[PDB]
Amino acid sequence: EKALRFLAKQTHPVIIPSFASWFDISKIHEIEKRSNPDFFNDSSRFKTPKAYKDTRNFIINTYRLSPYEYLTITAVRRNVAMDVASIVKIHAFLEKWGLINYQIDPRTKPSLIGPSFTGHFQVVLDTPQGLKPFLP
Amino acid sequence: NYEQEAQKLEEKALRFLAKQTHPVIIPSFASWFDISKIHEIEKRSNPDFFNDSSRFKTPKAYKDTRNFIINTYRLSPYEYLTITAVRRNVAMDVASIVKIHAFLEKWGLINYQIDPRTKPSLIGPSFTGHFQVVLDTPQGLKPFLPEFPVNLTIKKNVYDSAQDFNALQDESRNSRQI
Amino acid sequence: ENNGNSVKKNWSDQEMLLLLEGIEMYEDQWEKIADHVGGHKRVEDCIEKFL
Amino acid sequence: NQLIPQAYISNFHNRLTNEDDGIPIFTMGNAVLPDLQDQHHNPFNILRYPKIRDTFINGKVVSPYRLSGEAIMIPITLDIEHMGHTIKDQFLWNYNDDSISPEEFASIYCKDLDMTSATLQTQIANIIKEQLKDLENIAATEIMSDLHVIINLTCNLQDRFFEDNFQWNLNDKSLTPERFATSIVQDLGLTREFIPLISQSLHETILKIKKDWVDGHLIQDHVPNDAAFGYLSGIRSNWCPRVEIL
Amino acid sequence: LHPRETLTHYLWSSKQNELVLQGDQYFNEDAARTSDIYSNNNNDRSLMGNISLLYSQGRL
Amino acid sequence: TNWLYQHSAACSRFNSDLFYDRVKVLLVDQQGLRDAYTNILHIPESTQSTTVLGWRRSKNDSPSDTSIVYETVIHDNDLNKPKTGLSEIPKEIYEDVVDEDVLRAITEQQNFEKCNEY
Amino acid sequence: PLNWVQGPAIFHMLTSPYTQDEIINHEMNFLKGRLLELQEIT
Amino acid sequence: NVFQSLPKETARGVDDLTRMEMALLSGIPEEIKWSLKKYLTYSNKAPYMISLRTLPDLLPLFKTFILPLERIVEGLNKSSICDSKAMDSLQMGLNALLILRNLAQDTDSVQILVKDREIKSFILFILKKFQCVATGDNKWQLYEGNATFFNELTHYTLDLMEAISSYIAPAMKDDHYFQTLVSILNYTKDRYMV
């Protein structure tokens, strides 16, 4: 009633992996019902399933509008009025099944700032009679 | 296209490698440790992360702060790493990060007071062999490829003997021939 | 000669001669042998070549 | 010979009082560090970098200091003026754990600052004892009944003030706020020092709100304001984070 | 009674005792006056690797 | 109308804006940072190859040689299938699935991901 | 409480036999040459 | 200038006693061999350095080698020691048993060994198996090829029983130590053991 136009006008075409062929864009079913069951078994007044429908549609279509960039958690939090503790659940759920961060430019994914990786560094051993190299 | 993308990935991977200039000495009894996986000595000395008692102490956060401490030590080996320098960068409670720092200093993985000029050198294992460490592809330098198991040696390096393996001399002595 | 020779473990006749001159000189003191060879060889290789 | 010893340099306090490095602890090619550039196996080359002969010239020699079913996290602020220079920082504390005493943390924390005045330790430990004993039965709560409060949040770090808005459910315990601040700083590209400083500025607000659920017991679970997309169907979100330099 | 873990014991211990008896064959008269110990026997590796240690102890 | 498209386009512009912010400062302008507490150049983790796989042995060509060849290498399997992790899912969930070749594709992707070693 | 102390002189003999009668003379010489060197410290 | 004021006492790495104490606490087997050899040398030549009164966190570090030797003694009636991995554990256990035998002639390293209620279970176990050898009972007949593994196993236990018996000075009626040794005395032919 409102998203038909939005899927029609400005959405880049659908790319979906083979182990996501069980996905249903219309309604939900038992996989999403048993993975995160808090939206269904009366957790609160807020977590009714229709809001879950609206948020999963908004996330997957927001990835449809730009399939070559990583859809981050903050950029969907700007216009989804829901718990951040459930935005994280739905976002990790949809990324986990390879739907909405599947085929992207790999230099778009946010990585945490940190020091370099020292695994290829050379270590030498402090043997009690010398300094033999550490070569397994 | 595959050869050019492989050469491109090799170039922009050697661009980010953190080349070694300082040797790192660990004590011989702490040779059980590996950067990648968690050993059973760490699982019985710090059980608070593996009992699933609290929510703020998972093995993933343990491994992240452990690799953080060891990687910020080995890039500057000559400098004594302190607790306050680590506490401002990692988000854990203070007691646990003090436990992990005292653990890593107990085994001599960090902060190992030694002067290697007053000890000899040895040849323990065999002489020859193409010792090649196998890393992973850093996801972020992968090719774009809008629609291939190529392995690439980044840095070749030869050593004549263990005495120049211990001091990081790569037969550059043809430059400085004394 | 005075020039730096080729890649190590070649042992040209000049270096063999100077090694044997050093062993006739000093009878010990392998630092004073290895510099008399030319100083571009270690003690731990002059002993491995005289044996 | 010709090998650097593995330790014995602890040039940390001079970078605390460098006045170029933006450290808020004290008051009174074109790269900078060779962690991506080889030096062709001469250590002397590392003396061309201007922050590294700073740690060999101005360095000193240090001696190494030698040494429950549910954690309860309590944020602790620290604000002490002492001989012109001050100390303003913040850190969490595990109330259920007692493996380290605040006297021992005061002896450790005073040693990196290179004060060792033997009376800063007592003052720091008394402030920590005070802020722990003031909050012993306010962070041990068992909150139910779906509060879902709104949170404005600010962070002060050297005229680079962080501020954001979000809806929070403090009834489920799935989302660690340290993981939340990690997800923020991964996205905005900030330095790693904002990783504790947001979460340490969040737990306090959690026990500010928890406070009103227990002390006055004011429920006031009435319309957390939204934008008619999620929970409360107005017509069928709030804001976004930012870093403002004042 | 149980033949498996005594034949494995035989195949282990006979091999180990053969190695122990063949631990002494390069210390003869005319096997040490010649040169086929020091040169080219990196296959052996046992001696001529102690020379980095024995000079550092002053024995020579 | 004109609500939901406007909101989703604003989300995508905000996403690309955060990307163009985070890519210039860290990697392009000065290629890293500098921690003030420790003299360590911070770098984004995506260019760093987090794990380390097994070792490999060999021998040099000429016998009776004493030289050591220490080196590195990269490795991956096929470098095109991504790492959307299905192994962090228990095996009791996806057994009321609709098809059987869907189950085969899930097991194929999981057996691909468990071949991180060589 | 730490005290960085020099350890005792342990007689590690160069050649190591196994029968006792090939050891006792060397160990007597070690006991004499240690207790005489140590007696002057008192 | 900063590389001139190094403390001379710590510029060799760690000291050897902490090296020996950490080497056993790891799991590297050759470094365990080195640590046990050096503990044996220091126990023979200067036992007061490894006096249990001084270093209290050292006796469980030997219990963790001596206590899994009971399974080996149980399985020693057949040719059990097949590979080169169980034998190394056997030799480490016998060497740690010798170290605790050598520390038990001190009268201050002895009361800590007596007050432990688990070393005496091992002594009683070894003596019960040697009583099964000395009587000739059909249960647990000794395999002869393991006999040199067992013989020096039972000379290092009696020397503990010779040292701790003064602290078992109240003798009961139906005692197992007294019954076992009075069974052993009829069998043996060693002057030292008698």
Swiss-Prot record, chain C:
Residue ranges occupied by any SANT domain in the UniProt entry: 6-51
Cellular localization per UniProt: Nucleus
Anything else known: Present with 3380 molecules/cell in log phase SD medium.
Biological role stated in the UniProt entry: Component of the chromatin structure-remodeling complex (RSC), which is involved in transcription regulation and nucleosome positioning. RSC is responsible for the transfer of a histone octamer from a nucleosome core particle to naked DNA. The reaction requires ATP and involves an activated RSC-nucleosome intermediate. Remodeling reaction also involves DNA translocation, DNA twist and conformational change.
Subunit structure: Dimerizes via the C-terminal coiled coil. Interacts directly with HTL1, NPL6, RSC6 and the N-terminus of STH1. Component of the two forms of the RSC complex composed of at least either RSC1 or RSC2, and ARP7, ARP9, LDB7, NPL6, RSC3, RSC30, RSC4, RSC58, RSC6, RSC8, RSC9, SFH1, STH1, HTL1 and probably RTT102. The complexes interact with histone and histone variant components of centromeric chromatin.
Protein name, UniProt field: Chromatin structure-remodeling complex protein RSC8
Natural source organism: Saccharomyces cerevisiae (strain ATCC 204508 / S288c) (Baker's yeast)
Parent-protein start and end of this portion: 305 to 355 of 557
Swiss-Prot record, chain E:
Residues that span the membrane, as ranges: none
Subcellular location: Nucleus
Family (UniProt): To yeast SNF12.
Further details from the record: Present with 2470 molecules/cell in log phase SD medium.
Role this protein plays: Component of the chromatin structure-remodeling complex (RSC), which is involved in transcription regulation and nucleosome positioning. RSC is responsible for the transfer of a histone octamer from a nucleosome core particle to naked DNA. The reaction requires ATP and involves an activated RSC-nucleosome intermediate. Remodeling reaction also involves DNA translocation, DNA twist and conformational change.
Subunit note: Interacts directly with RSC8. Component of the two forms of the RSC complex composed of at least either RSC1 or RSC2, and ARP7, ARP9, LDB7, NPL6, RSC3, RSC30, RSC4, RSC58, RSC6, RSC8, RSC9, SFH1, STH1, HTL1 and probably RTT102. The complexes interact with histone and histone variant components of centromeric chromatin.
Name listed for the protein in its UniProt record: Chromatin structure-remodeling complex protein RSC6
Source organism of the structure: Saccharomyces cerevisiae (strain ATCC 204508 / S288c)
Complete-protein stretch covered: 424 to 483 of 483
Curated annotation (Swiss-Prot), chain F:
Localisation: Nucleus
Region (Functional region): 1-118
Chain's role: Component of the chromatin structure remodeling complex (RSC), which is involved in transcription regulation and nucleosome positioning. RSC is responsible for the transfer of a histone octamer from a nucleosome core particle to naked DNA. The reaction requires ATP and involves an activated RSC-nucleosome intermediate. Remodeling reaction also involves DNA translocation, DNA twist and conformational change.
Family (UniProt): Belongs to the RSC7/SWP82 family. RSC7 subfamily.
Subunit (UniProt): Interacts with ARP7, ARP9, RSC3, RSC8, RSC30 and STH1. Component of the two forms of the RSC complex composed of at least either RSC1 or RSC2, and ARP7, ARP9, LDB7, NPL6, RSC3, RSC30, RSC4, RSC58, RSC6, RSC8, RSC9, SFH1, STH1, HTL1 and probably RTT102. The complexes interact with histone and histone variant components of centromeric chromatin. Component of a fungal-specific module (HTL1-LDB7-NPL6-RSC3-RSC30) within the RSC complex.
More info: Present with 3510 molecules/cell in log phase SD medium.
Name of this protein: Chromatin structure-remodeling complex subunit RSC7
Gene: NPL6
Swiss-Prot record, chain G:
Disulfide bonds: none
Organism domain of life: Eukaryota
Compartments it resides in: Nucleus
Additional remark text: Present with 1750 molecules/cell in log phase SD medium.
Function: Component of the chromatin structure-remodeling complex (RSC), which is involved in transcription regulation and nucleosome positioning. RSC is responsible for the transfer of a histone octamer from a nucleosome core particle to naked DNA. The reaction requires ATP and involves an activated RSC-nucleosome intermediate. Remodeling reaction also involves DNA translocation, DNA twist and conformational change.
Subunit structure: Forms a heteromer with RSC30. Interacts with LDB7 and NPL6. Component of the two forms of the RSC complex composed of at least either RSC1 or RSC2, and ARP7, ARP9, LDB7, NPL6, RSC3, RSC30, RSC4, RSC58, RSC6, RSC8, RSC9, SFH1, STH1, HTL1 and probably RTT102. The complexes interact with histone and histone variant components of centromeric chromatin. Component of a fungal-specific module (HTL1-LDB7-NPL6-RSC3-RSC30) within the RSC complex.
Name of the protein in its database record: Chromatin structure-remodeling complex protein RSC3
The organism of origin for this protein: Saccharomyces cerevisiae (strain ATCC 204508 / S288c)
Taxonomic lineage from the root: Eukaryota, Fungi, Dikarya, Ascomycota, Saccharomycotina
Gene: RSC3
Part of the whole protein covered: 155 to 196 of 885
